[PDB]
Paper text:
Nora virus is a positive-sense, single-stranded RNA virus infecting different Drosophila species including Drosophila melanogaster and Drosophila simulans. Nora virus ORF4, situated at the 3′-terminal end of the genome, encodes a 931 amino acid-long polyprotein. The Nora virus capsid asymmetric unit is built from three subunits, a single copy each of VP4A, VP4B and VP4C.
We determined a 2.7 Å resolution Nora virus structure using electron cryo-microscopy and single particle image analysis. The Nora virus reconstruction displays an icosahedrally- symmetric particle with a T = 1 (pseudo T = 3) triangulation number; a capsid architecture previously described as one of the main characteristics of the order Picornavirales. We were unambiguously able to trace the C-α backbone for VP4A (residues 1–249 out of 264), for VP4B (2–242 out of 251) and for VP4C (1–364 out of 416). The disordered C-termini regions are presumably exposed on the capsid surface, as the last visible residues contribute to the striking protrusions that circle the pentamers composed of both the VP4B and the VP4C C-termini. However, the most prominent capsid surface features are the 60 mainly α-helical protrusions that are situated at the interface between VP4C contributing most of the residues and VP4B contributing one α-helix. It is fulfilled in Nora virus by extensive interaction of VP4B and VP4C N-termini around the five-fold but at a much greater distance from the five-fold axis of symmetry. The symmetry-related, positively-charged histidines (residue number 9) of the two VP4A N-termini on the two-fold axis closely interact with the ssRNA genome.
Author numbering:
A (entry chain A), B (entry chain A), C (entry chain A): 1 to 364
D (entry chain C): 1 to 212
Amino acid sequence: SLPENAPNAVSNPQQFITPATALSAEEYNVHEALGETEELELDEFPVLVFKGNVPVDSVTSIPLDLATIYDFAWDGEQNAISQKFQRFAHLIPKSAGGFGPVIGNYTITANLPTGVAGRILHNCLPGDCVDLAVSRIFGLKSLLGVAGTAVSAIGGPLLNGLVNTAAPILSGAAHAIGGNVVGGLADAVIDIGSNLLTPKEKEQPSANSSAISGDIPISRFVEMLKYVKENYQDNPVFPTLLVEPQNFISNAMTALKTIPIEVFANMRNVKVERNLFDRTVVPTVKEATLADIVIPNHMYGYILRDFLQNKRAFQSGTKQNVYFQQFLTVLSQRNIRTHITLNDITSCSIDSESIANKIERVKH
Amino acid sequence: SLPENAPNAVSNPQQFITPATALSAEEYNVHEALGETEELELDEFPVLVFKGNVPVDSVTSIPLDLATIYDFAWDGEQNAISQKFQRFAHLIPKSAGGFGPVIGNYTITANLPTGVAGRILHNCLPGDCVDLAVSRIFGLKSLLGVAGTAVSAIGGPLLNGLVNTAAPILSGAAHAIGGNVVGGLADAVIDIGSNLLTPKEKEQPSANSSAISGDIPISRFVEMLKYVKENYQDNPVFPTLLVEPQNFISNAMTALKTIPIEVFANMRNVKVERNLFDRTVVPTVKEATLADIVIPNHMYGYILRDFLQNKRAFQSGTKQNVYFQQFLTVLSQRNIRTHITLNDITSCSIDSESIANKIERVKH
Amino acid sequence: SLPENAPNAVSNPQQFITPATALSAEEYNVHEALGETEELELDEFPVLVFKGNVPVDSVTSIPLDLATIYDFAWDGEQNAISQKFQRFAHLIPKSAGGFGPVIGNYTITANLPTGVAGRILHNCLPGDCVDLAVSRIFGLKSLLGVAGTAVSAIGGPLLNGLVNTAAPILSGAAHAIGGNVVGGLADAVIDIGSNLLTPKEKEQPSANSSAISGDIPISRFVEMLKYVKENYQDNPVFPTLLVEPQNFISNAMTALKTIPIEVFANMRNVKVERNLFDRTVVPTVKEATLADIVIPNHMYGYILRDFLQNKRAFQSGTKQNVYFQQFLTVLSQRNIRTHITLNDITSCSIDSESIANKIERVKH
Amino acid sequence: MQNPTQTMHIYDMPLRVIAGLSTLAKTTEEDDNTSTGIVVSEVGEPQVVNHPAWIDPFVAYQLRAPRKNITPDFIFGRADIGNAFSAFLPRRFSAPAVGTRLVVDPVFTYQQRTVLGLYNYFHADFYYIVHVPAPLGTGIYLKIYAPEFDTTTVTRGIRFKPSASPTIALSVPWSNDLSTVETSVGRVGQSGGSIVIETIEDNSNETVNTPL
């Protein structure tokens, strides 16, 4: 499933704000003829990966590490995506895209009243290139400058980021008082491969809800998706979702901050192999929060270069100069391991000021 | 009526947020070739089952006990659904769904101005599995984790939870000043079995109103629906509607609480048998409020287990720890009967604190 | 004109909230082959019958007595409907509906900003059954319990109760700056009998405006509509419009009260006979307000019974107990006439309290 | 492959009535009591019943509508007893007063209680033959129906005059919201196989020994 549509040579500006990621998928190195498709009903539950408030005019990272992921719409220990990583050793992507092999989609949704109005920039970078993720988080670069970025305007008078399910019962709710159940069942049984409207979500459009969604790529060198958690700190595989709310004014023409959103995810694009029994080392889902980000050893000079080619990171009192003094301090620390964390570049101490942080770093 | 549409194998994500409840109906044990269809005009009045305010970010139970139900849109003693239980002994469901045999639909509606915006999660569990109902009420589990849950976004700029009737007169209101009566009559006489738009509710859509609706299942072991009120406290049959309003912010970006909704219901999917005269023991519709919930004797360890596999129910000061100390106290009481009520786990006293409530319970 | 469409046996719940009023029209006793159709251009002016504020969660009576009716959109003595009753003795309805012969339609309209949102219940009972009118006015019964009630949600993001005319000039306004005149002329000359959209009100829908309308029935025993004003106080013929605004919250989630609406009416479904000259007794249109309601002598025990089967009318401090003590006082008065007025059951004095009002009434 | 079903045979039917009653009609064409006035039936005209424990066929009034009776077979153990060791067993009752009510509870033979005692759950259908011998000055008018929930509830049944049709016969199928009740317990509120006899009038002589 989850096809590979061929675009045109030139992208039409009325649909896309960036060029296309590629004109063909990138299915080398992935061993697609290897597993066995395993469609159980547990795969059809989505996962509430992120829920909460998100600051306006700042890129927010959502580390989308599906092996150790937590579900905020469920109180249990495992969920629909992480139990798939408990049961099997090998997960094999079905198809691919312009970034890498792709294993799922995400969905951003936000129920807003009509008195606020803004827009959302979103992109999901594979994690083979985490520099482009981290440079966007630190305010050094914007999301509009990398291919694959979409813009969706949640306001509104606008029916964009919204979820409408219409329950999967065999009755279809044919005796409903004062209105029609739109797109539920006993309208159309639209296939997962096809992409159509039912017939009733063509004149409704409150229940049609043009979604804010992308895909979940992994990385373009692995053959399958065997998770070890020591190897993926050295060569990361799982992607990172980048979200940026831009304008968001109120009816008093006052710029808002910290809007509420929530992100759903599913992984319905994989094949399985090597079913495992009574194992000891498990992928250890962290309770109640998240994963963080891993910056490996060979990514340091790429993060270092992007601060240096930024005129705003040198002047004091700005947000980029805070991260850059926190970045130079962590490089002068003592690391027994071969990677640092984004949280280490947020909860660190401070010195004075920029140049002496670099002279002490070329000696260490 | 009220058909049984066959879905696809994999549910399309643009319509459904959960997997399908089943791929076929579950019409074993129900004796469909037994009654006689009885279509009187009183069946075409819906019943306002619930009306009032409902708290945000908390699952609200609506016990949908149709034998003893009250109508808030009518002041009389009986109504359209409960008089059907007065007149006959046996009610026979026509068709079935993924949960059980199904006897009707509900409809949630809410007239909101454009300055507030949220979403609604709703599901209607059969009552053969009341543990999944009660675990969701107590905040132990969410509605997104069980099959059949729909999500509808009432805001809004959105035309979702709304009722438009357009009166059933034979004139059709053909002399109306300044506008067309949409979908009333002298447009189309759309059948109850078919699911179409008239021709005038295709370009109107203010009067089309994509509904928030599900179905009313009963239970998968009974042969018909003979109501005794002593047997249904031991093996419950009637379902429970679970409603959860999620976000609901205002134009000041302030989270609301306690939104107003109201719920309609109908039972137009049954056959009748065994017409009864001058009876003494009647199903006793309770005036002006509701039914409550019955938790039978064989459901205690299922409620007990779900508190134990919840990390939030053990820490003090939270909402789940209040219910769990109220649950352990009621099990240490004296019950002459073989069931407890959800109201007994709300209006109970308190002790100190968790562990000593369980040591005194293993002795009783 | 104004046809008689045949509905299905079972009403579809996505369009209707009540059962159908009848499956056939009720054209006995009306002498349709009697008059002569008289289409003058004065008939194509609607009448603003009601204008003003209307309280929320209370049924508001609009006595729709077309012989003596006042127009609030015109300052003159007569209007489009009442001059028809000046000129002729006999008015003959063309066609009929489930209630009675029908002579016109009404239209409720309300221009609301997007920051408030509610719903409207409306029904127009013939006046052969004024008990069902008066029981709804006094809060004893709701509009959802009688056949023919429609529900329309004015909010909004919703384009429901709105009037768009697009002036009847022969030019069609073909030179209009920056937009198209929708449905005026030089689009389509849609017939009064047909029910179509032009072609331009199919993609506009701001100018399509799904209307809030019903019909104006009279009564099922008269042969024609000879108005005497003494006979219609004993056996009333003209209908009564019942309007109920339900929820109506603001952006501060605060329940409103007293919304503004206005009601249009027309009578374009009649035939005339017996043209009258230099008459003395005229139907006397009352200046600047309205008619009231007439409750005849044989309707007393029907109003009396509905208070008695209401548990809320006996407890003190409620609105229904105020009317019931005012109803029992008027029955103990001295009536030289054979009917009472609804205004007599509003502007009356008070006693103490309920039971002694009834013991003094069984003696008078 | 299913474990095989085994059959046992019973041979010649203990307590079989081999000389029946002459007042009970064998075919529907020889029965017109509904037509003139003798039987006032609200459940239809009587249909022909063939049963092995009674020698000749007889017409019976269907007090409940005939059905198929789903038998769930998922647990271990199943048996079709099926008219084996089956008999029409008689009992005498006095006719009640005009206000009161008589409930006849069903009975069954010793050999049916033994074989059905090897199992836990059952269902069955029932038949009744009511005979009121009416000597001379009999003006009784009776009423028979099936009880439903409690003591006062009345359903559709038959009314008849025993002076002109002394024997009446009935057919009571299994109607319950649970198939296969427990044998010794039953469901609360069930009908079972009970019938209800009620006296409407007593227009008899002074010489007739009443409570007949």
